[PDB]
Design an enzyme around this catalytic site. Structure first.
Site, short mmCIF file in Angstrom:
data_model
loop_
_atom_site.label_atom_id
_atom_site.label_comp_id
_atom_site.label_asym_id
_atom_site.label_seq_id
_atom_site.Cartn_x
_atom_site.Cartn_y
_atom_site.Cartn_z
N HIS A 94 7.55 58.48 126.41
CA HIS A 94 7.74 59.93 126.26
C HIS A 94 8.18 60.28 124.85
O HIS A 94 7.77 61.30 124.29
CB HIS A 94 8.76 60.37 127.29
N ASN B 211 4.85 67.55 128.13
CA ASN B 211 5.06 67.59 126.69
C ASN B 211 4.89 66.24 126.01
O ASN B 211 5.74 65.36 126.16
CB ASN B 211 6.46 68.12 126.39
N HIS C 14 15.86 64.67 122.69
CA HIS C 14 15.56 66.04 123.09
C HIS C 14 16.78 66.77 123.65
O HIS C 14 17.79 66.16 124.03
CB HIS C 14 14.41 66.06 124.11
N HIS D 37 17.43 59.99 125.04
CA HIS D 37 16.56 60.24 123.88
C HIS D 37 17.02 61.50 123.18
O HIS D 37 18.07 62.04 123.52
CB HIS D 37 15.04 60.23 124.22
N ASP E 231 17.45 68.25 126.43
CA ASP E 231 17.88 67.92 127.78
C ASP E 231 18.71 66.64 127.83
O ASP E 231 19.21 66.27 128.90
CB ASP E 231 16.71 67.88 128.77
ZN LIG Z 1 12.19 64.60 126.23
ZN LIG Z 2 12.89 65.54 129.53
#
Ligand SMILES: [Zn+2]
Ligand SMILES: [Zn+2]
Length: 229
Positions: free
Chosen positions: A149, A180, A86, A84, A88
């Site tokens: 998420h 989050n 983000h 995804h 990380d």
């Molecule tokens: Zn994420």
């Molecule tokens: Zn994550």
């Protein structure tokens, strides 16, 4: 030995952990405020090359990841998939590009990463636009199970050894809150988990985006955590 954690990975370092034949997870950390956090990705052998799933959460860590892979495995990373948008997952993509890796993700992830001002994998995985879509990519399947998420989150399955990388759509067992949810779709998350459960009923290992690997129980655990709210 034991799965690496924030309490035993030396600061700055990245660890690998063998999960099954030709499959490792990678574990990195990023301290924010007083709490040190860890993050998992995957490495899958194919022929005499490696497929990387997710960066090691930032440029510095991703350099260390590539060095650790060379030291411990000694085969080149030729392609990557980010699961995804983000940091990380895509933070460190430019390091991968510098190292000659062909970097991939879904079209939606590239769009969200661009909107967020994050690094952007160079190439799109087609036929991943609708929930339930799946594509083969070398030694893995990439599945888009729907929003959870994040709107774009993907999972990756290694069919030969029944390893499911759930990424951040799947919570570790010890986690009892969703964390989050700024980009989450809580309403769709349970249906997304059900699609994963239905598609991969023989998975033996399920790896969350953060924390300890488990088995298929992590899927229903995640739904339970989501229901809290
Ligand atoms: Zn994420
Ligand atoms: Zn994550």
């Amino acid at each position: 030995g034991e799965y690496p954690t924030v309490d035993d990975i030396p600061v700055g370092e990245v660890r690998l952990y063998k999960i099954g034949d030709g499959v490792w997870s990678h574990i990195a950390t990023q301290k924010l405020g007083d709490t040190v956090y860890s993050s998992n990705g995957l490495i899958v052998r194919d022929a005499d090359e490696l497929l990387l799933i997710d960066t090691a959460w930032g440029a510095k860590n991703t350099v260390a990841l590539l060095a650790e892979i060379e030291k411990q495995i000694g085969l080149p990373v030729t392609r990557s998939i980010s699961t995804h948008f983000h940091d990380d997952r895509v933070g460190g993509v430019d390091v991968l590009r510098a190292a000659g890796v062909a970097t991939y993700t879904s079209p939606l992830t590239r769009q969200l990463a661009e909107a967020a001002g994050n690094e952007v994998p160079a190439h799109s995985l087609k036929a991943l636009s609708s929930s339930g879509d799946v594509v083969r990519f070398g030694p893995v399947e990439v599945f888009y199970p729907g929003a959870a998420h994040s709107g774009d989150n993907l999972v990756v399955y290694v069919p030969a050894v029944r390893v499911l990388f759930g990424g951040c759509a799947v919570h570790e067992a010890s986690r009892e809150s969703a964390g989050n949810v700024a980009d989450a779709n809580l309403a769709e998350w349970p249906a997304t988990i059900k699609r994963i459960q239905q598609r991969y009923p023989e998975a033996e290992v399920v790896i969350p985006g953060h924390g300890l690997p488990g088995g298929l129980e992590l899927l229903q655990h995640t739904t339970n955590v989501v229901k809290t709210k």
